[PDB]
Structures are given as C-alpha cells and as structure tokens.
Amino acid sequence: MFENITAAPADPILGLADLFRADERPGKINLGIGVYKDETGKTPVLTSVKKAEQYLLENETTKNYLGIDGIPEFGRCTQELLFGKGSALINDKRARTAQTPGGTGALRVAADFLAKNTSVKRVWVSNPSWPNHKSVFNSAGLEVREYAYYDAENHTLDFDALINSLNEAQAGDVVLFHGCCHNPTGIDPTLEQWQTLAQLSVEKGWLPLFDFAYQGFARGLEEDAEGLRAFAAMHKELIVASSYSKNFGLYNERVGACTLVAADSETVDRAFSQMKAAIRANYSNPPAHGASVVATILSNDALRAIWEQELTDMRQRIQRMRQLFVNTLQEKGANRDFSFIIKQNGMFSFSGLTKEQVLRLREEFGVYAVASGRVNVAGMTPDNMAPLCEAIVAVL
Amino acid sequence: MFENITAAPADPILGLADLFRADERPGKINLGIGVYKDETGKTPVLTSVKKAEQYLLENETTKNYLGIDGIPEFGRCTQELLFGKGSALINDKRARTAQTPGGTGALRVAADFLAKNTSVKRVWVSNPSWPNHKSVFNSAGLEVREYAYYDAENHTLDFDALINSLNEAQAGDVVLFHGCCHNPTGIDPTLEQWQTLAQLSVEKGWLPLFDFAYQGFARGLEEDAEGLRAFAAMHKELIVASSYSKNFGLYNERVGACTLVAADSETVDRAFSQMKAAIRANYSNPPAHGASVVATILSNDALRAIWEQELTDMRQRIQRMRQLFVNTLQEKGANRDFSFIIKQNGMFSFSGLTKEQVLRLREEFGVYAVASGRVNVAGMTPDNMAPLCEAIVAVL
Numbered sequence: 001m002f003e004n005i006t007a008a009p010a011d012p013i014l015g016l017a018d019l020f021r022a023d024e025r026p027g028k029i030n031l032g033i034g035v036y037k038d039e040t041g042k043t044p045v046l047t048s049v050k051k052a053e054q055y056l057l058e059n060e061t062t063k064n065y066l067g068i069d070g071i072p073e074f075g076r077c078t079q080e081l082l083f084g085k086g087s088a089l090i091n092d093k094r095a096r097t098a099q100t101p102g103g104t105g106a107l108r109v110a111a112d113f114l115a116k117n118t119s120v121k122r123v124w125v126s127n128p129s130w131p132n133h134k135s136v137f138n139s140a141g142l143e144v145r146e147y148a149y150y151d152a153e154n155h156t157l158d159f160d161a162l163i164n165s166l167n168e169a170q171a172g173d174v175v176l177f178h179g180c181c182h183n184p185t186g187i188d189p190t191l192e193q194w195q196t197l198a199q200l201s202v203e204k205g206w207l208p209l210f211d212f213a214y215q216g217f218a219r220g221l222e223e224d225a226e227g228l229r230a231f232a233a234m235h236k237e238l239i240v241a242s243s244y245s246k247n248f249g250l251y252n253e254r255v256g257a258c259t260l261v262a263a264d265s266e267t268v269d270r271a272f273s274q275m276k277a278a279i280r281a282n283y284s285n286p287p288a289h290g291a292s293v294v295a296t297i298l299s300n301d302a303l304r305a306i307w308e309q310e311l312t313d314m315r316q317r318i319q320r321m322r323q324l325f326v327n328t329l330q331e332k333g334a335n336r337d338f339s340f341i342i343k344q345n346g347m348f349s350f351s352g353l354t355k356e357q358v359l360r361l362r363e364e365f366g367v368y369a370v371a372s373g374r375v376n377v378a379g380m381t382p383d384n385m386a387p388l389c390e391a392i393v394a395v396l
Numbered sequence: 397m398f399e400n401i402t403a404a405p406a407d408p409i410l411g412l413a414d415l416f417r418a419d420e421r422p423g424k425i426n427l428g429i430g431v432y433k434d435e436t437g438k439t440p441v442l443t444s445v446k447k448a449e450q451y452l453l454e455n456e457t458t459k460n461y462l463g464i465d466g467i468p469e470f471g472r473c474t475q476e477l478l479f480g481k482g483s484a485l486i487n488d489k490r491a492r493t494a495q496t497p498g499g500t501g502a503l504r505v506a507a508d509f510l511a512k513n514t515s516v517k518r519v520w521v522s523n524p525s526w527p528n529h530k531s532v533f534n535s536a537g538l539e540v541r542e543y544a545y546y547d548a549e550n551h552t553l554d555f556d557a558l559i560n561s562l563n564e565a566q567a568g569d570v571v572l573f574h575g576c577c578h579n580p581t582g583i584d585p586t587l588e589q590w591q592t593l594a595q596l597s598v599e600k601g602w603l604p605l606f607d608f609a610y611q612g613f614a615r616g617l618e619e620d621a622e623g624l625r626a627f628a629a630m631h632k633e634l635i636v637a638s639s640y641s642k643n644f645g646l647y648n649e650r651v652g653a654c655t656l657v658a659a660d661s662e663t664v665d666r667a668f669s670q671m672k673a674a675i676r677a678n679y680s681n682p683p684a685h686g687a688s689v690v691a692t693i694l695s696n697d698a699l700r701a702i703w704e705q706e707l708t709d710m711r712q713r714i715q716r717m718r719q720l721f722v723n724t725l726q727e728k729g730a731n732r733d734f735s736f737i738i739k740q741n742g743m744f745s746f747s748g749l750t751k752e753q754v755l756r757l758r759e760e761f762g763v764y765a766v767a768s769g770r771v772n773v774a775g776m777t778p779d780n781m782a783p784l785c786e787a788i789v790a791v792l
C-alpha cells in the first residue's frame with residue numbers, strides 16, 4: 001500500500017540542512033536556516049537557560065502529565081509578554097493560552113481549531129512568506145491565498161498594493177500577519193501602518209492571526225508587540241501563535257503558545273475548550289521541559305534580567321553583522337547597492353539574488369542561502385564575512 | 397466569530413483529573429488517569445532519568461533543531477526495543493523511525509500520513525478501546541468502525557467475536573492492535589492467538605497499526621513485543637506508534653515514536669519522506685529532552701541496567717497491587733468475585749462496575765475511576781487499599 005507513494009520534495013529550508021551536512025568542502029558557509037550564531041559560529045545554550053535547567057534538575061520531583069494547555073504561569077507570563085501587564089485582555093480575562101510544541105505547532109492547532117468550529121475556509125498569507133504557513137494551513141482543510149507585500153524593485157513594503165489586495169478578502173476570512181521580523185524580507189510595518197490594518201480588519205470583519213516568533217529581535221520586546229497590541233485594543237477576537245525558540249535559544253525543546261482572545265470570558269472559555277480538544281487529538285499535552293525553563297526565567301527577576309541581556313546581545317550581534325555585510329560588500333566590489341539590508345529586522349535579509357545565483361553559490365562556492373535568496377545574517381561571522389562577500393560578489 | 401462555538405465535552409479520562417483537583421474531600425482517592433504511583437503515591441522521576449538529565453546538563457552545548465524525524469540513536473534504539481537486536485527489519489533497512497511528541501502524536505502523525513498518501517478510508521479499533529483512538533483518527537479524516545474484543549461475562553477476550561467482526565473489514569483497511577496491556581480491560585492475546593491474527597491480516601490484506609505504549613509492563617520488554625513480532629515476521633508493511641511515557645516515567649516530556657516498516661528500503665524511504673512532510677506541518681520537529689534522555693539511558697549499559705531494574709520494580713508493584721485488591725475486596729465485605737483482576741496486564745483493570753456505581757463512588761466517597769469502571773491499579777497503595785475496597789463494596 002506504500003508502493004505507490006511519491007517521494008515528497010525537499011523542504012526548501014530544512015533541505016539545505018542535509019545539503020550542507022554533506023558538502024565535504026572545507027570553508028563551507030551555511031546561511032540557510034534561521035538559528036543564531038555567536039562570533040564563533042555556535043548556537044549555544046543561553047546562560048539563564050543552563051541555570052533554569054540546574055534548578056529544575058534538583059527541584060523536580062515528577063514527570064507526570066502537564067494539562068492540555070500546559071503550565072499555567074507559562075501562559076500568564078506569555079500573555080504579559082504579548083499584551084502587557086496592565087492590559088485589559090488580561091484584566092478582563094479575554095485571553096486563553098495553550099502551551100504548544102513550537103510556534104509552528106501553535107499555528108496548526110489554531111488552524112485545526114478554526115477549520116472545525118469556525119466558518120472559515122480561507123486564510124490569507126502574504127507574498128512572499130515563510131513557506132510552511134501554506135502547508136500547515138492546507139493540512140487543516142483551509143485554503144490559502146496571497147496578499148501583496150513586498151515591493152521587490154525598491155525593497156520595501158508595498159502598502160497600496162498590500163491594502164488593495166486585502167480588500168478582496170471577505171468578512172470571516174482569517175488574515176495572517178507576522179508580529180515583527182517579516183520572514184523573509186524582514187520589512188515590517190510602522191506603527192502607523194499597523195493601526196490602519198487594525199482598523200481596516202475591524203471594518204472588513206477579517207480574523208487576524210498573528211505569527212509571533214521573534215519578539216525581541218527587532219528593536220526591543222515590548223516594542224515588537226506594538227503592532228500586535230494595536231489590533232488587540234480594537235478587535236474582539238484574535239489568535240497569536242507565539243514562539244520562544246529564538247529569543248530563548250530553545251529551538252529543540254519546542255516551546256510556543258497559542259493565545260486565543262475573544263470578546264469575553266465565557267466565550268473564550270467555551271471556544272478554548274474546543275481548542276483543547278483539537279490538541280488532545282494531536283499530541284495530547286505539551287512537552288514540559290522547555291516551558292518549565294521559560295516560566296522559571298520569566299518568573300525569577302535575577303534570571304529574567306540575565307536573559308534580557310543575553311537576548312539584547314544576540315540582537316545587536318546581528319544589527320552589527322548587517323552593516324559589516326553591506327560594508328564588506330562594497331569594499332569587496334559589488335554593484336548592487338545593498339544598503340537596504342540595514343533597513344530590515346531579525347535574522348534574515350531578502351538578498352535579491354537570483355535563484356540561479358544562489359545555486360552557483362552552493363556549488364562553485366559552498367555558500368548556502370535559501371532559494372529565495374534569503375540569507376541568515378545571524379550566521380554571518382567576522383571570520384566568514386570575507387570569503388562570503390567574495391562569493392556573493394563573484395556571482396553578480 | 398467564536399460566539400457560536402459550542403463548548404466541548406470533558407475528556408472521559410483527562411477531565412476526571414480536573415474533577416479530582418477541585419475535589420475537597422481529604423481522604424479522596426484517584427484511580428483515574430493511567431499514571432504510575434509508588435507505595436507513598438508519587439510519580440517520581442526515575443533515578444537513571446535524573447542521572448541522564450545530569451549528564452545532559454553537563455554535556456550539552458546546544459539547543460539547535462533536531463531533524464524532522466528527531467534523534468537517530470533514539471530511533472535505532474527504539475527499533476531494537478520493538479524488533480530485536482539483529483532482526484531482519486533492521487539489517488534490511490525496511491524500517492524508519494520518527495521521534496514524535498508522545499505516543500498520541502505518533503498515532504496522529506500516522507493517521508495524517510495514511511489519510512493523505514494511501515487509499516485508507518477506515519480504521520478498525522477494538523471495543524472497548526482507549527477513547528482517543530477515535531478522536532485522533534477522525535481528525536485525520538479516517539473513519540473508525542469497531543471490532544469485538546471483550547467478552548464481559550467471563551472477562552476474557554473471545555477470539556471468535558473478534559475474528560468474526562473483523563472478517564468484515566475490507567482489504568486495505570487499517571487494523572489497530574494494542575501491543576500489550578489492552579486499554580482498558582488489560583486482556584491480551586496469547587502468542588498463538590497473535591500468530592493466527594498475523595496470518596489472517598496477511599490474507600485479508602490489512603495494514604496493521606500497533607499502539608505500543610506499555611512495553612515492559614506485562615511480562616517484559618521482549619515478551620511484550622512478541623505479537624508485534626509475529627506480525628513483523630509476516631508482514632511487508634507495518635506501522636508502530638510506540639511510547640516511552642510510562643516505562644521511563646517520562647509523561648510530560650512527550651516521548652514516543654512512529655515506526656514505518658515497508659517491503660524494502662527504497663519504498664520505506666519514499667514513504668517515510670512523506671511521513672516527514674506530514675510532521676513538518678504539525679509541529680515541525682520533535683522536542684529533544686526526553687528523547688535525549690532515553691537515548692542516553694538506552695545507550696549506556698550502566699544506566700540501562702538501572703533503568704531496567706526501576707521498570708521491573710514498577711511492573712511488580714502493580715502485580716502486587718492486583719492481588720491485594722482482590723483479597724481485600726474478597727473479604728472486606730464483597731460478594732462479586734473479582735479474581736479476574738489478576739488475569740489482566742498493565743496499569744488498569746476493567747472492574748465491570750456499573751457506570752452508576754462509578755458515580756456513587758466519586759460523589760459519595762471521593763473514589764475516582766473512569767466511567768467504563770476502568771480503575772488504575774498502579775494508583776492503589778497499601779494505605780488506600782482499605783478505604784477504597786470499602787467504597788467499592790458499599791456501592792455494589
């Protein structure tokens with residue numbers, strides 16, 4: 001019954017992984033996937049984490065099942081990370097958080113929830129976009145259509161075009177926004193541009209679904225949740241699929257949350273009970289480690305304090321690597337002015353390199369970008385910036 | 397948009413748990429969920445586990461993403477756990493393992509794979525069965541019909557009504573077997589009976605799906621994989637959804653696997669590549685901790701040795717809790733003969749108690765069993781073995 005099965009095509013992002021872990025060449029550089037790297041090119045375990053792990057280690061008396069939605073204070077700490085301490089969504093008890101296996105697993109369960117207790121049929125995810133939004137949504141029933149986003153010619157956010165294409169969505173449709181650090185492109189909207197969409201989506205009756213996987217990597221933390229917070233004030237319902245894989249360097253422990261906001265307690269209560277059932281039929285309850293760790297660090301002022309410093313380093317290690325990239329680009333003799341790279345936010349940068357350029361790089365040169373020409377700045381190092389900038393500069 | 401959403405019914409199993417927590421009566425007992433307990437009544441973190449967590453804390457330099465299918469060694473170790481040291485599925489490369497969030501996640505990943513890469517439209521689960529087999533498959537699309545199993549007058553399993561009801565399953569249908577420790581009831585097929593079913597499904601053209609979540613709790617790790625092995629000898633394609641949450645006491649860390657065996661390497665490879673695609677859109681990759689542990693303990697002969705002893709203890713304590721349950725019952729005032737509780741295997745016993753009886757217990761004596769009258773033996777201790785057995789007897 002399997003004789004018939006087609007060999008699925010390689011994941012555009014996770015394929016590189018293997019493709020790299022096989023290029024036997026010496027100075028092979030991996031600019032693919034979006035995982036941090038320090039000056040040495042390692043993705044280390046955060047210090048606050050190590051400490052939270054020490055604590056747990058000695059303070060854990062059991063491994064007995066979490067709840068369907070996970071660790072309570074993990075949710076509460078998550079909400080305040082999202083909305084903000086005082087916050088009426090919190091003070092009115094409108095939000096309900098389930099802890100999930102990844103921000104990628106927060107998306108799916110929102111989806112399976114939506115497509116099964118809701119009237120939706122379509123979900124709108126920008127162009128371009130993180131290629132797995134499509135797949136997690138189709139896997140749920142839902143069909144995905146695109147809205148205009150990026151002005152490629154001039155490397156920015158084509159707002160008119162964004163707005164005009166959204167106007168063709170229907171009331172009751174779910175429209176997906178990235179909270180900050182647009183993947184790829186890293187072009188995000190201004191606070192102003194965020195309020196507008198907030199107001200529009202209220203008039204047009206769309207249901208905003210936020211993919212929030214990089215709080216803290218562009219600007220700040222309570223500053224990354226700004227757009228998200230402009231919608232919350234206006235709307236009556238929303239869904240945030242949060243992730244703590246990057247900002248807590250917890251990639252393989254799988255930590256994220258699915259926040260469901262509704263008009264009121266009893267409703268969100270009632271709705272949330274369905275979301276729970278949707279998870280129960282997926283993975284049952286969430287993996288305790290990574291979240292026990294995040295709640296601990298966020299629960300403890302010493303650790304939390306350490307943690308915010310550790311993240312503020314990661315962030316700035318990047319803002320730096322942006323500059324150095326363009327600068328070495330020029331001094332190494334490029335034509336295309338790449339100054340736009342500095343305008344972007346997060347681990348990536350839409351390079352503007354042809355698909356066949358990015359193919360030559362992986363072959364003539366060992367350099368590994370995503371086929372969109374997306375490069376992980378956070379994997380560029382003062383030591384590899386030179387061999388890299390020569391490759392890139394040798395294929396233009 | 398959520399205004400219309402209906403509140404989901406509480407999980408028959410997982411909602412007893414909320415029921416029990418909110419219960420204020422002091423001498424309250426909880427035979428609900430299937431989580432192991434010790435003489436004192438705690439769900440301790442096994443020793444070899446703390447020892448491995450210590451190794452990890454020390455030796456792990458990173459949190460970087462595991463691959464879609466997770467940790468290799470975990471996989472290779474799981475296969476010898478299921479199949480054998482040098483079983484032909486292993487030396488032939490017929491099998492491929494994916495690390496998944498729990499055994500309820502290996503089940504779902506399989507359902508999504510089947511209902512998308514095969515023609516399967518229905519899955520046959522026994523009567524009775526763990527109530528989430530349905531909810532899981534139905535979420536994949538698949539329809540579940542149900543085969544006879546439990547002969548309730550004589551608390552045995554009539555192979556006949558089981559065979560007969562199955563004769564109706566078509567060829568290309570999925571048949572779901574419990575590797576050992578049937579849930580609930582705890583009745584299992586002899587080896588003879590297992591090979592007869594091995595052969596049957598070989599003729600009738602079924603694709604057996606095995607839910608293996610209690611390896612080691614009936615007789616032993618090998619004596620418990622006999623059925624799965626009689627099958628494995630005969631079939632060309634198989635799917636095993638194994639779990640490590642009980643026998644490694646790793647409940648909230650979510651550790652299990654989805655093993656995919658097919659006729660040859662290229663097939664399984666091809667098939668598996670699509671099973672990977674199905675995981676990529678659920679949770680993306682699996683949570684590292686508990687799998688890291690299991691790999692660690694399983695690939696370290698000392699730790700292994702500790703582990704096997706800790707498992708042998710659990711297993712025997714329950715065995716001890718069974719007869720003590722009979723005997724006490726047996727002369728704490730009972731009339732109904734429950735000696736069959738001893739025939740059963742694993743954490744639970746199918747008490748054959750009126751679902752109105754199981755209501756009186758919980759409401760009049762704080763004793764908590766599931767509405768089927770499934771009681772958790774591994775939650776019975778010498779200390780509560782008397783008030784419990786006094787409750788039962790008051791309501792029968």
Ligand SMILES: Cc1ncc(COP(=O)(O)O)c(CN[C@@](C)(CC(=O)O)C(=O)O)c1O
Pocket residue numbers: 013014032033034035101102103104105130178183211213243244245251255256679680
């Ligand atoms: C925009 C975006 N949203 C959500 C997720 C979900 O992440 P999580 O399950 O790991 O929480 C990612 C991860 N995407 C990465 C960083 C890796 C990937 O390809 O999955 C990326 O390279 O874009 C992401 O990039």
Ligand SMILES: Cc1ncc(COP(=O)(O)O)c(CN[C@@](C)(CC(=O)O)C(=O)O)c1O
Pocket residue numbers: 283284409410428429430431497498499500501526574579607609638639640641647651652
């Ligand atoms: C028959 C059966 N299959 C698979 C699983 C999956 O467990 P995992 O995801 O945790 O690996 C369980 C757990 N079922 C329990 C022990 C608990 C539950 O209801 O979830 C039960 O009480 O039967 C099980 O009982």
